[PDB]
Short mmCIF file of all heavy atoms in Angstrom, two decimals:
data_model
loop_
_atom_site.label_atom_id
_atom_site.label_comp_id
_atom_site.label_asym_id
_atom_site.label_seq_id
_atom_site.Cartn_x
_atom_site.Cartn_y
_atom_site.Cartn_z
N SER A 65 48.05 100.26 -68.19
CA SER A 65 48.07 99.37 -67.05
C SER A 65 49.44 98.77 -66.82
O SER A 65 49.89 98.62 -65.68
CB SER A 65 47.04 98.25 -67.24
OG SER A 65 45.71 98.77 -67.23
N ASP A 66 50.14 98.39 -67.90
CA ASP A 66 51.46 97.81 -67.75
C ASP A 66 52.43 98.82 -67.15
O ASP A 66 53.26 98.47 -66.31
CB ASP A 66 51.97 97.31 -69.11
CG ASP A 66 51.27 96.04 -69.59
OD1 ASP A 66 50.50 95.41 -68.82
OD2 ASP A 66 51.55 95.65 -70.74
N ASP A 67 52.33 100.08 -67.53
CA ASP A 67 53.15 101.10 -66.90
C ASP A 67 52.79 101.26 -65.42
O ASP A 67 53.68 101.39 -64.57
CB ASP A 67 53.00 102.42 -67.64
CG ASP A 67 53.64 103.58 -66.91
OD1 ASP A 67 54.87 103.76 -67.05
OD2 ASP A 67 52.91 104.31 -66.20
N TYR A 68 51.49 101.24 -65.10
CA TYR A 68 51.07 101.32 -63.70
C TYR A 68 51.69 100.20 -62.87
O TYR A 68 52.22 100.44 -61.77
CB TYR A 68 49.53 101.30 -63.59
CG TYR A 68 49.08 101.22 -62.14
CD1 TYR A 68 48.82 102.37 -61.40
CD2 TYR A 68 48.97 99.99 -61.50
CE1 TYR A 68 48.45 102.27 -60.04
CE2 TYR A 68 48.63 99.89 -60.18
CZ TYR A 68 48.37 101.03 -59.45
OH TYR A 68 48.04 100.90 -58.13
N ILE A 69 51.61 98.96 -63.36
CA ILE A 69 52.15 97.83 -62.61
C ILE A 69 53.68 97.91 -62.50
O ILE A 69 54.26 97.57 -61.47
CB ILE A 69 51.69 96.50 -63.23
CG1 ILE A 69 50.17 96.35 -63.16
CG2 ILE A 69 52.41 95.31 -62.58
CD1 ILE A 69 49.64 96.06 -61.77
N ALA A 70 54.34 98.32 -63.58
CA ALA A 70 55.80 98.45 -63.53
C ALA A 70 56.23 99.44 -62.46
O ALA A 70 57.29 99.26 -61.85
CB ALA A 70 56.32 98.89 -64.90
N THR A 71 55.43 100.46 -62.19
CA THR A 71 55.77 101.47 -61.19
C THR A 71 55.34 101.06 -59.79
O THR A 71 56.07 101.29 -58.82
CB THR A 71 55.07 102.78 -61.55
OG1 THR A 71 55.55 103.25 -62.81
CG2 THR A 71 55.30 103.84 -60.48
N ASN A 72 54.16 100.46 -59.65
CA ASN A 72 53.50 100.30 -58.36
C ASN A 72 53.38 98.87 -57.88
O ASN A 72 53.07 98.66 -56.70
CB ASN A 72 52.10 100.91 -58.42
CG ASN A 72 52.13 102.37 -58.74
OD1 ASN A 72 51.76 102.80 -59.84
ND2 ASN A 72 52.58 103.16 -57.79
N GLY A 73 53.60 97.88 -58.74
CA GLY A 73 53.36 96.51 -58.37
C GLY A 73 51.87 96.18 -58.41
O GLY A 73 51.02 97.04 -58.68
N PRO A 74 51.54 94.92 -58.14
CA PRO A 74 50.16 94.47 -58.26
C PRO A 74 49.23 95.09 -57.22
O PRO A 74 49.64 95.51 -56.14
CB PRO A 74 50.27 92.96 -58.02
CG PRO A 74 51.55 92.79 -57.26
CD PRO A 74 52.46 93.82 -57.83
N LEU A 75 47.95 95.12 -57.58
CA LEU A 75 46.91 95.47 -56.62
C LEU A 75 46.72 94.32 -55.63
O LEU A 75 47.27 93.23 -55.79
CB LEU A 75 45.59 95.76 -57.34
CG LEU A 75 45.54 96.93 -58.32
CD1 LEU A 75 44.14 97.07 -58.90
CD2 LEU A 75 45.99 98.22 -57.72
N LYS A 76 45.93 94.60 -54.59
CA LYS A 76 45.42 93.60 -53.66
C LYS A 76 44.07 93.10 -54.15
O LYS A 76 43.29 93.85 -54.72
CB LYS A 76 45.21 94.24 -52.27
CG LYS A 76 46.46 94.86 -51.65
CD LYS A 76 46.18 95.65 -50.39
CE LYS A 76 47.45 96.27 -49.84
NZ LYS A 76 47.19 97.15 -48.69
N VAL A 77 43.78 91.82 -53.89
CA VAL A 77 42.39 91.37 -54.04
C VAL A 77 41.53 92.15 -53.05
O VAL A 77 41.85 92.23 -51.86
CB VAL A 77 42.27 89.85 -53.82
CG1 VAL A 77 40.81 89.41 -54.02
CG2 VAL A 77 43.18 89.09 -54.76
N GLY A 78 40.45 92.74 -53.55
CA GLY A 78 39.64 93.68 -52.80
C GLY A 78 40.00 95.13 -53.03
O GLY A 78 39.25 96.01 -52.58
N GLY A 79 41.11 95.40 -53.72
CA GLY A 79 41.59 96.75 -53.92
C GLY A 79 41.25 97.31 -55.29
O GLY A 79 40.54 96.70 -56.09
N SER A 80 41.76 98.51 -55.55
CA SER A 80 41.43 99.21 -56.78
C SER A 80 42.49 100.25 -57.10
O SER A 80 43.29 100.64 -56.24
CB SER A 80 40.06 99.91 -56.68
OG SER A 80 40.10 101.02 -55.79
N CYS A 81 42.45 100.73 -58.34
CA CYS A 81 43.18 101.94 -58.72
C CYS A 81 42.36 102.69 -59.76
O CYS A 81 41.57 102.09 -60.50
CB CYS A 81 44.59 101.64 -59.25
SG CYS A 81 44.60 100.74 -60.81
N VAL A 82 42.57 104.01 -59.82
CA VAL A 82 41.94 104.88 -60.80
C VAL A 82 42.93 105.14 -61.93
O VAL A 82 44.03 105.65 -61.69
CB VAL A 82 41.49 106.21 -60.18
CG1 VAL A 82 40.86 107.09 -61.25
CG2 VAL A 82 40.52 105.97 -59.03
N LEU A 83 42.54 104.80 -63.16
CA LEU A 83 43.32 105.09 -64.35
C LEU A 83 42.42 105.80 -65.35
O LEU A 83 41.26 106.13 -65.06
CB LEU A 83 43.95 103.81 -64.90
CG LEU A 83 45.06 103.20 -64.03
CD1 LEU A 83 45.52 101.85 -64.57
CD2 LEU A 83 46.25 104.15 -63.95
N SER A 84 42.96 106.09 -66.54
CA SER A 84 42.17 106.75 -67.56
C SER A 84 41.01 105.88 -68.03
O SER A 84 41.11 104.65 -68.09
CB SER A 84 43.05 107.09 -68.76
OG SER A 84 42.30 107.70 -69.79
N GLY A 85 39.92 106.53 -68.41
CA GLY A 85 38.84 105.85 -69.10
C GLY A 85 38.97 105.83 -70.60
O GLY A 85 38.10 105.28 -71.28
N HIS A 86 40.03 106.42 -71.14
CA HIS A 86 40.32 106.40 -72.58
C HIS A 86 39.11 106.93 -73.33
O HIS A 86 38.59 107.99 -72.96
CB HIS A 86 40.80 105.01 -72.99
CG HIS A 86 42.02 104.60 -72.24
ND1 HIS A 86 43.28 104.96 -72.66
CD2 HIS A 86 42.16 103.96 -71.06
CE1 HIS A 86 44.16 104.52 -71.77
NE2 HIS A 86 43.50 103.92 -70.79
N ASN A 87 38.65 106.25 -74.38
CA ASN A 87 37.52 106.68 -75.18
C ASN A 87 36.18 106.27 -74.59
O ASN A 87 35.15 106.55 -75.21
CB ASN A 87 37.65 106.09 -76.60
CG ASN A 87 37.86 104.58 -76.59
OD1 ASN A 87 38.66 104.05 -75.83
ND2 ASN A 87 37.14 103.89 -77.47
N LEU A 88 36.17 105.63 -73.43
CA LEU A 88 34.95 105.05 -72.87
C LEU A 88 34.34 105.87 -71.74
O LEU A 88 33.13 105.82 -71.53
CB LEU A 88 35.25 103.65 -72.35
CG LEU A 88 35.81 102.66 -73.37
CD1 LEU A 88 36.15 101.34 -72.70
CD2 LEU A 88 34.83 102.45 -74.51
N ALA A 89 35.16 106.61 -71.00
CA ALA A 89 34.75 107.30 -69.78
C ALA A 89 35.87 108.26 -69.42
O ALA A 89 36.97 108.18 -69.97
CB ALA A 89 34.55 106.30 -68.63
N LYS A 90 35.59 109.17 -68.49
CA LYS A 90 36.67 110.01 -67.98
C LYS A 90 37.72 109.15 -67.29
O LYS A 90 38.92 109.22 -67.63
CB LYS A 90 36.11 111.08 -67.04
CG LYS A 90 37.15 112.10 -66.61
CD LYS A 90 36.50 113.29 -65.93
CE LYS A 90 37.49 114.43 -65.72
NZ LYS A 90 38.55 114.09 -64.73
N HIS A 91 37.29 108.32 -66.35
CA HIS A 91 38.16 107.48 -65.55
C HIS A 91 37.68 106.04 -65.62
O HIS A 91 36.49 105.77 -65.79
CB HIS A 91 38.11 107.88 -64.07
CG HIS A 91 38.46 109.31 -63.80
ND1 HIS A 91 37.53 110.24 -63.40
CD2 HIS A 91 39.64 109.96 -63.89
CE1 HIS A 91 38.12 111.41 -63.24
NE2 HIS A 91 39.40 111.27 -63.53
N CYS A 92 38.62 105.11 -65.43
CA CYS A 92 38.30 103.71 -65.18
C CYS A 92 38.77 103.35 -63.78
O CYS A 92 39.95 103.52 -63.46
CB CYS A 92 38.96 102.78 -66.20
SG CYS A 92 38.60 101.02 -65.88
N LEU A 93 37.83 102.89 -62.96
CA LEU A 93 38.15 102.35 -61.64
C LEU A 93 38.35 100.84 -61.80
O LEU A 93 37.38 100.10 -62.02
CB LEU A 93 37.03 102.66 -60.65
CG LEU A 93 37.27 102.15 -59.23
CD1 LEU A 93 38.42 102.92 -58.55
CD2 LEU A 93 35.98 102.23 -58.40
N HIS A 94 39.61 100.40 -61.75
CA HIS A 94 39.93 98.98 -61.84
C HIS A 94 39.77 98.38 -60.46
O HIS A 94 40.51 98.73 -59.54
CB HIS A 94 41.37 98.80 -62.33
CG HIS A 94 41.59 99.30 -63.72
ND1 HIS A 94 41.39 98.51 -64.84
CD2 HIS A 94 41.94 100.52 -64.17
CE1 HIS A 94 41.64 99.24 -65.92
NE2 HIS A 94 41.98 100.46 -65.54
N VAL A 95 38.78 97.49 -60.29
CA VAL A 95 38.47 96.90 -58.99
C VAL A 95 38.70 95.40 -59.07
O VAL A 95 38.23 94.75 -60.01
CB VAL A 95 37.01 97.17 -58.58
CG1 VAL A 95 36.71 96.50 -57.25
CG2 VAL A 95 36.74 98.67 -58.52
N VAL A 96 39.42 94.84 -58.10
CA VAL A 96 39.72 93.42 -58.04
C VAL A 96 38.75 92.76 -57.06
O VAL A 96 38.91 92.87 -55.85
CB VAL A 96 41.17 93.14 -57.65
CG1 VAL A 96 41.44 91.65 -57.77
CG2 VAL A 96 42.13 93.94 -58.51
N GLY A 97 37.74 92.07 -57.58
CA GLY A 97 36.96 91.17 -56.77
C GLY A 97 37.64 89.82 -56.70
O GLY A 97 38.51 89.50 -57.51
#
């Protein structure tokens, strides 16, 4: 996540990004409510 933010800047409230799910899932959808 820190690498993602360093490259792209912060998300928007209401927005999302797809990153790895690591050992938990294929993907993690990070959603900002």
